[PDB]
Amino acid sequence: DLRLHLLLNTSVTCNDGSPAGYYLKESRGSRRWLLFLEGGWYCFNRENCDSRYDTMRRLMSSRDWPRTRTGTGILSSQPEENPYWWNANMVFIPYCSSDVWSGASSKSEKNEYAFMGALIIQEVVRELLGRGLSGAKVLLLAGSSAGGTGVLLNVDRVAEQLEKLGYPAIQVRGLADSGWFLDNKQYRPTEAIRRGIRYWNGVVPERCRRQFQEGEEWNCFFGYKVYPTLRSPVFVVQWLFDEAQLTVDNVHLPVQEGLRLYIQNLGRELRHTLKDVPASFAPACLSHEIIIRSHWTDVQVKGTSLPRALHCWDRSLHPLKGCPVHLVDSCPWPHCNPSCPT
Numbered sequence: 001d002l003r004l005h006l007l008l009n010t011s012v013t014c015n016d017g018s019p020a021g022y023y024l025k026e027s028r029g030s031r032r033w034l035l036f037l038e039g040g041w042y043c044f045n046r047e048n049c050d051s052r053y054d055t056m057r058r059l060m061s062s063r064d065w066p067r068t069r070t071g072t073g074i075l076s077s078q079p080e081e082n083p084y085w086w087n088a089n090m091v092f093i094p095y096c097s098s099d100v101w102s103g104a105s106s107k108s109e110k111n112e113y114a115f116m117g118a119l120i121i122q123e124v125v126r127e128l129l130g131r132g133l134s135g136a137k138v139l140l141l142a143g144s145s146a147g148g149t150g151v152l153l154n155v156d157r158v159a160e161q162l163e164k165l166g167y168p169a170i171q172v173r174g175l176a177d178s179g180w181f182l183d184n185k186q187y188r189p190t191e192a193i194r195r196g197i198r199y200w201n202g203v204v205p206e207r208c209r210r211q212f213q214e215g216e217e218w219n220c221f222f223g224y225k226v227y228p229t230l231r232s233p234v235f236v237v238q239w240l241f242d243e244a245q246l247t248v249d250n251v252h253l254p255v256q257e258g259l260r261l262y263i264q265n266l267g268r269e270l271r272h273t274l275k276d277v278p279a280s281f282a283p284a285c286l287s288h289e290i291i292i293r294s295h296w297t298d299v300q301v302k303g304t305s306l307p308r309a310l311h312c313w314d315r316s317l318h319p320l321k322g323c324p325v326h327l328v329d330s331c332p333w334p335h336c337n338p339s340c341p342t
């Protein structure tokens with residue numbers, strides 16, 4: 001059980017003006033800290049955000065949040081369930097800004113909603129320093145889906161915040177799960193991101209913004225375009241046949257030749273984009289998200305599990321014999337890897 005703390009700075013808020021927050025479970029014998037960003041889509045205009053507020057309100061407000069949460073997967077404290085980091089300080093940051101963790105805009109007489117994702121992450125980091133994060137050796141910023149994209153947008157800002165605050169010994173790293181998407185041609189969109197950025201006052205990393213320049217910041221929401229501009233170490237987890245990617249592409253699974261070629265091409269392209277990503281884990285499966293699932297230990301690429309690959313990554317940041325860090329399936333069809341989830 002991680003326990004809820006609402007932010008002491010009550011001007012950093014969820015969409016509806018209620019305070020944002022985090023769930024925390026400390027481990028005082030550990031110098032490692034895991035901060036996990038929740039996912040859950042986004043909204044990009046007034047009518048679309050009003051709809052979300054009727055039927056997905058916990059992703060827009062803290063008024064109904066529970067006081068405790070169970071840590072699962074990489075957030076579990078049991079060695080059995082979490083071989084990687086079971087003894088770490090665990091933090092779950094709920095997603096209540098609907099902005100892919102990019103916003104920096106307050107509710108005002110001209111804004112029905114607040115979009116403060118990027119500022120929520122900064123304020124959580126600040127308040128944690130008073131509860132032991134000041135003694136950390138490693139800060140792993142992780143997240144799934146919208147939270148995985150949020151890792152890519154925010155990991156370098158957290159590193160800079162800690163440097164400027166006077167904590168140069170904390171090593172900031174990222175773990176992006178199921179947030180690596182392709183702006184490809186559909187089988188039968190990009191405009192939503194572009195409109196959302198203006199709606200949220202969204203912020204992207206500086207080096208990426210300088211490359212694409214004004215009006216084209218939407219490009220930095222795509223992993224293969226923003227990742228080359230990042231300085232902090234980032235481990236990328238991505239199913240080759242991600243279900244959210246296929247939903248966007250209007251693919252719904254007796255497959256004929258046109259769809260067969262389409263699906264095979266998608267795998268090859270995702271595969272191409274990871275070839276110069278040295279820390280990555282990409283199985284040939286139809287699925288979505290993994291790192292906080294209870295059975296996240298089951299899947300293997302080339303005989304190596306995801307918890308093992310992350311441990312090998314830790315060792316590399318101190319090639320390693322028998323302990324690989326770059327793991328990408330080569331077979332070209334969903335579930336050609338026998339360890340895919342069923």
Ligand SMILES: N#CC[NH+]1CCN(c2cccc(Cl)c2)CC1
Pocket residue numbers: 040041042100145146147149181182183184189190191244245248
């Ligand atoms: N966050 C989130 C949930 N969805 C993830 C997939 N998204 C996606 C995938 C491929 C192309 C484009 Cl334009 C968008 C939409 C949002």
Ligand SMILES: *[C@@H]1O[C@H](CO)[C@@H](O)[C@H](O)[C@H]1NC(C)=O
Pocket residue numbers: 009011012119
């Ligand atoms: C609270 O957060 C807001 C938004 O980031 C900021 O303007 C303000 O300085 C913060 N207040 C304090 C006391 O840190």
